[PDB]
Symmetry: D2
Subunit: 116 residues, 4 copies
């Protein structure tokens, strides 16, 4: 459980369910390598992306597929995705929750980082 993603919908006042999320990690040659992916649950949460063994230090990009979410609801949104790019585990393993709050022309994101 070192990486969890939580997504909320600011139009509905609800969890954002069935949101696709893709995680990438920067490789030594500066390309973005696929790392993990999944879908938010009925609570708007996505657990089980990685393990503490797999989730090594690096630069990670969490791409939340907001356009796909809004289009499935019949809405034409502004953004293609919401991206969150950060260095992880640089002073040892941490647990990361990446949260996003979505509207059709806006989003907010925050991180909660805890030390187990």
């Amino acid at each position: 459980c070192p990486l969890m993603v939580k997504v909320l919908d600011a139009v509905r006042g609800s969890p954002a369910i069935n949101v696709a999320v893709h995680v990438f990690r920067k490789a030594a040659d500066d390309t973005w390598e696929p790392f993990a992916s999944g879908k938010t649950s009925e609570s708007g949460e996505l657990h089980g992306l990685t393990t503490e063994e797999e989730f090594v230090e690096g630069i990670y990009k969490v791409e939340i597929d907001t356009k796909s979410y809004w289009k499935a609801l019949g809405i034409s949104p502004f953004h293609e995705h919401a991206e969150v790019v950060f260095t992880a585990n640089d002073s040892g393993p941490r647990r990361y929750t990446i949260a996003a709050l979505l509207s059709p022309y806006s989003y907010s994101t925050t991180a909660v980082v805890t030390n187990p």
Copy 2:
């Protein structure tokens, strides 16, 4: 558990702990009557404010004491509090989570409303 408040700190990347929260309900004479109060836990959550019997229809104000929070951390913030004012339980009982994300000169708030 029909009303829960969750507070996050956007400077630290952490739950906002020990945040005082006061809830008021508009009375028939248009004054704000004290309704419930409490403090966020180490997870940034405040549970147990009210009961489904007590939490009747009305207009409620959730005042999150952000200035007091920032001052206890040695920071001089802009706002006195963050306030969230809404009509509750007008089409029957609902469960409400009021969330706030705090910075010294800014805040965001959202509501998650679910039907049990």
Copy 3:
């Protein structure tokens, strides 16, 4: 002009036009007394609320009538209004912009305080 209010709409990607805004000043008995008010322009702005002479230190509340805004657009909203409560302090910079970004079940607000 020491106080400006800016309102944006996160659903339509636009300024929030013709939004009623009321400013109150906290009185000695802790009641809120009306101070200034108006409606946002086509750019989502409300200028001319007060003057340097009038805008003394104290606690002010800016109430933005978001419920009426959303209903006039045909959208069901959560909040009754958004309110921003702050202290004006002469030791800090002299122009205050209160900005708000509105969604039906959420809002964001920030202060930009400059000289």
Copy 4:
């Protein structure tokens, strides 16, 4: 000018001054090609990025160098950068303002698209 970027600082309550901003356009092979760049002004704004003739429909990415911004202020930041990815569409309004509100572990962004 069809594209403007506005950056605000939620810790200091100010414009985010001298922030590097890079705009990229998605190429046919899905790579990001540099399109425009600059540094925000004293008002937190970056004007003059492109012209109507240059700013054709397509997918664009605006990368805001928030990590450098925070470090120059002595504050420890979470993100490497903030990036805003969107499609320019000629069927919608013609001026795009991309606004971002920065905190060390969070950011908010909105689009204001007007004629």
